[PDB]
Amino acid sequence: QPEPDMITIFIGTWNMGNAPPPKKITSWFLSKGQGKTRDDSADYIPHDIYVIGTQEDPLSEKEWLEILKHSLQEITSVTFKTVAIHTLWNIRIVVLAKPEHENRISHICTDNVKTGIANTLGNKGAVGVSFMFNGTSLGFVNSHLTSGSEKKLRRNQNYMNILRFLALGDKKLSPFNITHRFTHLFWFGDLNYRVDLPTWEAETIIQKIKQQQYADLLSHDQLLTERREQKVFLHFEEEEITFAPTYRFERLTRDKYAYTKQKATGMKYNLPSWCDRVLWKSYPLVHVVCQSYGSTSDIMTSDHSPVFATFEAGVTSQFVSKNGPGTVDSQGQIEFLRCYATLKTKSQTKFYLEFHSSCLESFVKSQEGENEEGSEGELVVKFGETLPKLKPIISDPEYLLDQHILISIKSSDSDESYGEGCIALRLEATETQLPIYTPLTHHGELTGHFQGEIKLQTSQ
Ligand SMILES: OC1CCN(Cc2ccsc2)CC1
Ligand SMILES: OC1CCN(Cc2ccsc2)CC1
16 A cells, blocks of 8 residues: 555634534535535545634534534545544634544644633633644644734734644754644634724625625735735735635524624624635645635534635655664765845844754754844844754655755854744755755744755765
8 A cells, every 4th residue: 555645634614603513514524615615526535634623612522523523424434533632612623534544643742722811811712733644744723813803913913822832743843833843734713804894884795795706805804914914824825715704694594694783792893704714834845735715605503604625735655764764874965055044133142053854863053153234234144154964864865855954043142043944855956056045933923034055965
């Protein structure tokens, strides 16, 4: 049985509105309804991994797992295995995988983050799961962010607290937050960003929705505008939205949006919005293709409609050579040459790098760079040709060209990371000096850039 080089991943997000689901929810897992939908001819083909995020979930873990497994069994005739389930309050993540994947999946981690302080601590936050699938790390975050049209900044703060504090993936990657720990990271949930138009325009918005004319509404979607202004979700992707707003419906139909202020809403309007979203971030030059992104039309127990997204994701095999794991392969080397970091910091400490990668036996710490002033105010940290030659565990090009080097630039004075980034080894050539580049972030915000040249030697 050959190991796969591609899998498909189902991501679902549904704010259940504290109500039990209807007896049939198969449309969700089939990516049928509105938007970018899945071909009927694929209905019996199981996805490799199903990741289900709920919010306002009233069910027990046992009750929901029985509904999910039954649903998938009815669709596919496959009995899925439970990889992980984690619940914080009424926020839940379930990961299911085809039984043939059970021995391919390892290093399963779960965690949660509670957002807010005192008043604002008690029902919003995130749950997450990570694991290895053969040689590929996968992370999944289901977040229920702060509600209300006038709280986009709070949502952005919730996002930063979740990516800082959610402890998933390899703990040895200590300078790196979840936005750098995984080959593929999927972030989804009731992100609660709204269509930011005047209250008076509610009926106009509803009209536009009935005409399937989303352009003048998406131009006011807070998640798209905040992302465009680099306020949130920097370096994440989202498929184009081609489905109607998923919130806020009258229950038991989808014919009516319930937007008017009520005591039950705290006297807030809920103009129709795309609250329910799926975003991703994959390491550079890894295959990831969105094959569906839409909402169901026939599941009406909640004031939200379920959202689905599906992905092709590249994966690699668990490589063994005669040498590594457990020694270096002297036929392999990575040289980072004429490299410099451009930092936005106004500090004047010395800086060093750390190189982290599962292609190394352990992380590598450089000597200090030489600080210079840029012409527009910036700190430039020069490394010249002083960086350590990296000795990968396996030199085979079919392994090494699929790997990535995480880079942290750290203060000599404090050992704290000022910036994190990632470089692909999927080069156009080996034994050749080639340009490399990564932005650097810290707490998911842009803090600088790293650029220079790489020279990769493989056994070919
Ligand atoms: O693909 C990436 C670069 C191009 N964009 C930037 C953008 C446009 C609206 S929101 C964020 C999407 C992410
Ligand atoms: O000749 C002096 C300046 C250059 N260094 C090397 C260097 C370059 C970037 S970081 C360290 C050696 C001494």
